[PDB]
Scaffold this motif. Structure first.
Motif, short mmCIF file in Angstrom:
data_model
loop_
_atom_site.label_atom_id
_atom_site.label_comp_id
_atom_site.label_asym_id
_atom_site.label_seq_id
_atom_site.Cartn_x
_atom_site.Cartn_y
_atom_site.Cartn_z
N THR A 13 0.85 -1.22 0.00
CA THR A 13 0.00 0.00 0.00
C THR A 13 0.87 1.26 0.00
N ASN A 65 -2.42 0.25 -4.24
CA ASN A 65 -3.36 -0.05 -3.17
C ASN A 65 -3.02 -1.32 -2.41
N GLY A 66 -1.94 -1.97 -2.84
CA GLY A 66 -1.32 -3.06 -2.10
C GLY A 66 -1.88 -4.46 -2.24
N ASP A 73 2.01 -4.80 4.44
CA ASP A 73 0.56 -5.00 4.58
C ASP A 73 0.18 -6.11 5.58
#
Ligand SMILES: Nc1nc2c(ncn2[C@H]2C[C@H](O)[C@@H](COP(=O)(O)OP(=O)(O)OP(=O)(O)O)O2)c(=O)[nH]1
Ligand SMILES: Nc1nc2c(ncn2[C@H]2C[C@H](O)[C@@H](COP(=O)(O)OP(=O)(O)OP(=O)(O)O)O2)c(=O)[nH]1
Ligand SMILES: Nc1ncnc2c1ncn2[C@@H]1O[C@H](COP(=O)(O)OP(=O)(O)O)[C@@H](O)[C@H]1O
Ligand SMILES: Nc1ncnc2c1ncn2[C@@H]1O[C@H](COP(=O)(O)OP(=O)(O)O)[C@@H](O)[C@H]1O
Ligand SMILES: [Mg+2]
Ligand SMILES: [Mg+2]
Lengths: 660, 660
Positions: B181, B193-194, B230
């Protein structure tokens, strides 16, 4: 109140253009330390080999040609940003685009710049975003062929949609060749779950691949012929209740409708749903050949039969509640297209304006620009009387044609299927904005006879211009290599295939002569679009549609002026406009001619609308984005509006349905 | 009561096997009219060139070796169906599998048949489903390398997972190379956005590609090193509350844990989260080389620092509520593997038992069979005294080795990355079932010293057998072409890399001598699995774990017998067993030795469990599926069980966590 936000950008921005270029070209991502040039080598060199001409060409007063929320559109997402802060003045954007297009042809570059600054025309968003940058992706439209009825083909196609979706551009995806719910699968002695779960995949990839970084989630339109067996759930895709697992609320359903379907519906007769495995070939023909295949398959017991009006009823119930599915007529599109020599066309695109051939190995691309209609109004030699300069329109459309054709050669294609497609056929798309303003400014109500004649003249001059420019290009460089065998190669042009004689402002015979002799550069040229964001940049009404309201709060500037002129504008006047929801009809102390000129689109008959679309369409190579509007919509009301359009021979019968 | 459902299938089924084959081979899909042969050409011919031997080899009494819900498992999803109706008797399935494996080697074919009929061993579900059919996909495990940190690589990998997922087989997918992210993307000056939204894609493809037709939705395990940025949302993937958009409830999170992480946690120290773009190379080394890279990156300010115990606390909170994430130790796996000469291993698989090398161009495959432990119990020359026949075990494991190695050459691979991988390295995986039954039958409580010695002996004999069989194969056909350079090529075997001397039942020196001289056929041989469905087919307890309950209603058959023998079994006895939830402890009139032998797994210390896993692991080439069980679980309780296992040097520290 809106020069306050304009003259702060002039405050916090460099003047000299080449310095802005250098700034952009030398940019480095602070959080990362990697060089992130926001301009290509090519364009950098060209600016620098010509610093002084280019810098002195820009006129910075042209930045005040913009509006209240018109500038704050350019600001919030168009002008290149440096550190979350704007670094490009409106004029800088424009000059960059002109060079991205023209290269070492400086003369062409300056011509483009001027006409854009003055607001004669604009290019589509992707061109405004990307022209002149390192990997120039200037195209707005991709029509994708679903590659094969298999997991491999499906996932190859999904990949391609992500690769396209990550670099701007909307998608039209045609899926008629995917076997439906229940169908047999050999490789695993099992049974298919059909279109809806597959639609959920594409939906999920759309919300994940938010264009580029985090710019904005993708938009897909899906195209299906209504004989497909999953049709009833396909049309319901955007309902906001019932089982959540059967919807797919970020996609748009679009119907690719054969004539046969509409006959069965008005006949109050039967309709037969197939899987494309039990009925192969159906989307690979049209018209007569199709009705011969379909009828036989229907006889051979190969599908399931329903009451045609049962489907229709659902379709209308879907449209009334959600404004979708869109409606586009397969047969009209194929029969009247200069691409017929390539094979059968299988879909339109995201806004139902493009009509181009696609296949597993060729993905159709189109590049778009819009001409600004009000710009050619000329109140000449007396005032309080206006004329329309058609000779200038013809002039401008010729330059826009040259730009778009140069864009083809300098565009970066996200996928090889696209590059193969464009280099062979070279399609092109021009459109318009500010029709309603043009009508309003010329004192013609939208439903007037005078308005009808004007519509026809405008569209004739645009088509003729573009064909001629394209003919000169075929003289320098050859014709497009697919030219041999085309309707154009034999002298059949667009209005010809509608069996109509042209309105006659321009000399079609000499054009046809030249074309047959030297060919043409572009397979296609015309496709009027929605202009949903470009139109407000320029401050005109969207598209070629009437006004939705006399008050968007901010009041219609043509109306506003008129009420002051007559005195009647006071406070009773302020109120009954926010009260009556933008309507001036039935307002006590207001003259009739005003009521007539300022009809809201909910006050104009949709029959008038259809007629005007039918009129201009004979001059359109491709198609156009036709929204429809209704007060207290009944099943019967809608039915007649669909059939009416179909019978006029429209390609695109319905885009959205807006209600109440 | 369960010969009633057995002797109705014998009623409604053909006897003669070759007729059943013909029937299957000539099958046609009525609703479609296309020939759908359920047997390959190859095997059809072999049955027909040998009709009479094969038909007379089958003994149909062996169909009564099956249980209450044991047969109705074979019935409901294993035996080939014709028209939604069963067409294969249990013996027919077995004989088909034997031929699918052996080809023209009829002698081998008959050997396999007999030992399977008698329940000595069984092959894994995919082999039971597909052996002998037109496109034989017999493998259960795929370990996939995420191909590249790009949309192209991502979507190439997604394709591959669908192609694998559509033909049986579970997936282990390692994703450590996907930027997290916030991370910068050059090609579109945007921000990633990961992992979680990307996880949602794979999740969505899992629920759509319901294995083959509509058989059953896919199961993926995902592998991440806990230094990935993440991580906090990745571990929470299976929670059943909070924001729905951040979960992904059909996938299993699995941690690929480096030693360094566990040190920081017991030290009560710091832990640094990176994106793999700011910290490249980290999953491409292990042990010392890794700690040297990580420490430097940590010094160079390249990531974000957290309190190690903040992560741990979350991890435990996740496990307590959802039984996940699984825990597998990266360093243990790489340091103790005969595949080290190929490069660094990046993940395990769906049930945390496979440990094999994967890369963008090589996808690791493994084929599995389980030996039935109770089958070798021999109460010899007096009765009421039993022994364990290790010479027969060694014998059988040798045949299972030959089968699995033949399976490699005759398997159909769904993707070319898999075929390249197997033909080069030739890995193989054997396991077991009925340990608890073996213990129960031999009158040894699970926590006895006698039980501990038995565990060790069994696993030693299996490993030695398989290596020898593999050595003879390297004499006929060469060694596997990747043999030169391996720990095996120099005489280092598995227990060697644990720095232990073997328990000594078999002669390791002569085996090592032969291996160094002629090589070996298979890079790897051992990997005890969950047996979740194969174990109940045979009627034994799952795996190598103790019983969960003395009553699954149906009561423990060893317990049941004993309570009658002692008289005490009545109605007070019926009740306090459904009341006490399968526990016989604290039951008024019941002898101690019984209480001792029939401890439920919630009544055995998890420390004992870990020890036995540690003991057998020195004889395992690969790894094994270790579930853990707890009554009223506290944060402290769990912490000590994790660390305990880690320190024993286990590869797989935790599979599920079952609670209450
Ligand atoms: N939902 C779902 N659909 C599938 C699955 N396998 C195949 N399909 C559908 C997708 C395609 O539209 C169609 C054909 O798939 P393939 O060509 O990959 O299957 P295959 O070649 O084994 O069978 P075919 O001989 O072509 O019918 O079946 C699956 O596992 N799940
Ligand atoms: N959610 C989302 N992620 C993206 C998008 N584009 C790229 N990514 C992520 C996925 C990959 O892990 C990573 C790199 O993507 P690519 O290599 O396709 O991008 P590109 O080569 O243009 O940039 P690079 O120079 O490699 O950083 O960025 C997007 O449009 N949406
Ligand atoms: N929300 C959207 N997402 C992706 N593509 C879009 C979107 N809206 C429009 N397009 C693309 O642009 C065309 C429509 O143009 P238009 O609505 O006039 O946009 P603009 O004025 O920004 O150029 C369509 O052909 C479609 O491919
Ligand atoms: N639900 C599942 N979906 C897909 N693959 C599975 C599933 N369960 C197990 N597997 C595969 O089989 C192996 C586990 O074997 P096991 O649980 O013993 O199954 P069986 O007894 O049916 O052979 C794993 O390595 C995994 O790849
Ligand atoms: Mg196929
Ligand atoms: Mg890249």
């Amino acid at each position: 109140a809106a020069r306050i936000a304009i003259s702060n950008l002039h405050k916090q921005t460099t003047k000299q253009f080449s310095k802005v270029v250098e700034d952009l070209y030398r940019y480095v991502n602070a959080a990362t330390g990697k060089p992130a040039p926001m301009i290509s080598d090519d364009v950098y060199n060209i600016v620098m080999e010509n610093k002084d001409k280019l810098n002195s060409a820009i006129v910075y007063d042209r930045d005040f040609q913009y509006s209240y929320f018109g500038f704050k559109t350019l600001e919030r997402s168009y002008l290149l940003r440096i550190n979350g802060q704007v670094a490009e003045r409106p004029q800088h954007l424009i000059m960059r685009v002109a060079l991205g297009i023209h290269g070492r042809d400086i003369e062409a570059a300056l011509e483009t710049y001027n006409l854009m600054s003055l607001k004669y025309f604009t290019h589509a968003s992707p061109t405004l975003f990307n022209a002149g940058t390192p990997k120039p992706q200037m195209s707005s439209c991709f029509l994708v062929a679903m590659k094969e009825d298999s997991i491999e083909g499906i996932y190859d196609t999904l990949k391609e949609c992500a690769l396209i979706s990550k670099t701007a551009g909307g998608i039209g995806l045609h899926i008629h060749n995917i076997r439906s719910t229940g169908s047999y699968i050999a490789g695993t002695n099992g049974t298919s779950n059909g279109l809806i779960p597959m639609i959920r995949v594409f939906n999920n990839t759309a919300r994940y691949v938010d264009a580029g970084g985090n710019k904005r989630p993708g938009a897909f339109a899906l195209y299906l012929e209504p004989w497909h067996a999953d049709i009833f759930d396909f049309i319901d895709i955007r309902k906001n209740h019932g089982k959540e697992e059967i919807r797919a609320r970020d996609l748009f359903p679009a119907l690719w409708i054969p004539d046969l379907f509409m006959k069965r519906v008005e006949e109050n007769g039967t309709w037969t749903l197939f899987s494309p495995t039990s009925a192969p070939g159906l989307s690979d023909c049209y018209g007569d050949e199709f009705e011969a295949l379909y009828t036989r398959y229907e006889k051979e017991g190969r599908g399931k039969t329903i009451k045609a009006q049962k489907l229709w009823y659902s379709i209308l119930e879907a449209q009334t509640e959600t404004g979708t599915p869109f409606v586009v007529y397969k047969d009209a599109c194929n029969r009247k297209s200069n691409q017929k020599n390539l094979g059968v066309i299988k879909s339109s695109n995201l806004c139902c304006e493009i009509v181009e051939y696609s296949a597993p190995d060729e993905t159709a691309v189109c590049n778009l620009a819009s001409v600004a209609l009000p710009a050619f109004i000329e109140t000449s030699e007396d005032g309080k009387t206006s004329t329309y300069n058609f000779k200038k329109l013809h002039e401008i459309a010729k330059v826009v044609t040259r730009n778009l054709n140069r864009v083809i050669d300098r565009n970066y294609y996200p996928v090889e299927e696209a590059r193969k497609s464009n280099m062979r056929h070279r399609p092109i798309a021009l459109g318009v904005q500010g029709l309603a303003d043009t009508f309003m400014l010329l004192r013609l109500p939208f439903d007037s006879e005078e308005a009808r004649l004007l519509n026809i003249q405008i569209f004739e001059t645009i088509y003729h211009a573009s064909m001629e420019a394209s003919c000169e290009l075929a003289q320098k460089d050859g014709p497009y290599e697919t030219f041999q065998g085309s309707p154009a190669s034999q002298g059949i042009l667009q209005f010809d295939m509608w069996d109509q004689k042209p309105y006659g402002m321009w000399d079609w015979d000499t054009l046809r002569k030249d074309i047959m002799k030297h060919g043409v550069r572009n397979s296609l040229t015309m496709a009027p679009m929605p202009t949903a964001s470009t139109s407000q940049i320029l401050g005109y009404n969207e598209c070629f549609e009437p006004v939705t309201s006399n008050m968007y709060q901010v009041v219609n500037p043509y109306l506003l002026r008129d009420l002051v002129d007559l005195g009647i504008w006071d406070e009773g006047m302020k109120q009954y406009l926010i009260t009556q929801n933008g309507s001036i009809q039935g307002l006590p102390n207001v003259p009739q001619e005003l009521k007539d000129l300022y009809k809201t689109v909910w006050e104009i008959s949709q029959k008038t609308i259809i007629n005007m679309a039918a009129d201009r369409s004979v001059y359109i190579d491709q198609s156009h984005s036709l929204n429809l509007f209704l007060r207290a919509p009944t099943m019967g009301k809608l039915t007649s509006m669909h059939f009416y359009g179909w019978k006029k021979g429209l390609k695109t019968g319905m885009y959205y349905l807006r209600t109440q």
